Swiss-Prot record:
Lineage, top ranks: Eukaryota, Fungi, Dikarya, Ascomycota, Pezizomycotina
Entire protein: shown range: 90 to 419 of 419
Keywords per UniProt: Aspartyl protease, Disulfide bond, Hydrolase, Protease, Signal, Zymogen
Catalytic activity entry: Hydrolysis of proteins with specificity similar to that of pepsin A, prefers hydrophobic residues at P1 and P1', but does not cleave 14-Ala-|-Leu-15 in the B chain of insulin or Z-Glu-Tyr. Clots milk
Organism this protein belongs to: Cryphonectria parasitica (Chestnut blight fungus)
Gene Ontology molecular function, alphabetical: aspartic-type endopeptidase activity
Protein name per UniProt: Endothiapepsin
Domain Peptidase A1: 17-328
Amino acid sequence: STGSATTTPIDSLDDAYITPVQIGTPAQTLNLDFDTGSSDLWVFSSETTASEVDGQTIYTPSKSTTAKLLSGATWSISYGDGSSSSGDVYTDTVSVGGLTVTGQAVESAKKVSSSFTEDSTIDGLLGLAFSTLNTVSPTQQKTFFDNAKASLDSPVFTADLGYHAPGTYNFGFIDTTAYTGSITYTAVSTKQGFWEWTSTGYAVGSGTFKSTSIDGIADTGTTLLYLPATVVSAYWAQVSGAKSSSSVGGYVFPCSATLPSFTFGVGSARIVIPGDYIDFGPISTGSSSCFGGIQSSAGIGINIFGDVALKAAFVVFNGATTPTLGFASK
């Protein structure tokens, strides 16, 4: 089997991407944030505290003839941005782009933090990291990809995120028309539950490539590119007037600037992020200070290849017995 679904930016900055997902019988379609940095499929629901729902579409298990309470199971998750959610668990039929999993754990939110309430465009998350990170207790549950894997033509999914435009998540096949050149594959460590890999270095603009190993994660659920402070300083030093602002929370730059590109290494191959992809616009409406798309990881504990980096590539998440990641230009 295979599946193919379009993913669409939630706003004009590509802050996140939503993909329609069918849950239950008859189908209830919710727009979920596919997140290769976490491993829970959770949704706004008929059980979510009413004051914490503000425009989202909700899953109502009592209207699904295939829903069943997973008795005794609870979940609770906290994300790197400080947001969180928790609740109980149903199993139900879940389909993405024509690919159907029966018995998928659908985590129903009883509580969500303010950032989720305040984002009316995201109805939940669909985690695509390794199932060892799933938070359901006392019986840990499998991700959608883990459940579908055996039925897939090939044990892979691909992320093809657009710059200010829709893109595609495919399951079970590699669309050879969606990229240019060849795909370069690189080793993955699953020891922390993430799609963790080592980039071979970087370049700023037209500058020379610096060979240096940068361990980090491929995370579709993080907006920006978070790298070591040395790398990020070298980037922003090429932008007149750019500076790190403690009050704003990162590097800012004059909105009048033209930003240089940023290149990262995948083995001997190179992925170029155009300068425009690094512009996240005014820090507040009408400001002439703009927020940068490359930020320091120093306060995180891990480097994160988020959407800024991934949307410059066609990315293969290879879930074979020994997982690997593939990157191609497009």
